[PDB]
Design a protein around this nucleic acid. Structure first.
Length: 98
DNA sequence: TGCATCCGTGAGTCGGGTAATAACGGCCTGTACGCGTCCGTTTCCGGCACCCCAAATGAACCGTCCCTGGCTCCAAGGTGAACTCTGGGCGACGAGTGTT
């Protein structure tokens, strides 16, 4: 009912996230993105998978919106020195301890 | 000297075939056929006098059609760097929109 990846903590009952204990506010899109990253910590997620799950299976919009959303996440979640969300060129994104 | 009295030519065109009587032995021969026998022919069994005839049994044998040897001198595989897209990554900006 309560998840924790390194410094980030997630509570699904209230759908909230704290970093280092500080509560970080997100859009619903960023929130569901973060839940989808934390549930499968360790493995690389590909962009088809992201739009396939995170977003509606019918979503046929441009991919770059998910890159921009991941950038939004990187603004305020990877602000610390310990880099969390690692980009793999041509592969996707992995939420993993460095 | 008429005169009847024959007497001699017509008259065209492209399914078959229908019969009688006393005749009877006996001899001759004649041409055709049917017998028994003998001789020219001819045709092969195996022999030479040898005719030799020959494909098969030793050579070379030399040119040549295959092996081995070395040699290149080059054009293809290996070693560079850039760049113009090619693709992803980053970021900001704006109204249609979840809500009391």
């Amino acid at each position: 009912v309560r998840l924790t990846f390194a410094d980030i903590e997630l509570d699904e009952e209230t759908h909230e996230v704290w970093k280092a204990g500080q509560p970080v506010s997100l859009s619903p899109t960023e929130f569901t993105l973060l839940r989808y990253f934390v549930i499968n910590a360790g493995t690389v997620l590909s962009k088809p998978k992201i739009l396939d799950h995170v977003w509606r299976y019918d979503f046929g919009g441009d991919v770059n919106v998910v890159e921009s959303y991941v950038s939004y996440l990187r603004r305020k979640i990877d602000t610390g020195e310990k880099r969390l969300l690692h980009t793999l060129r041509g592969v996707g994104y992995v939420l993993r301890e460095p």
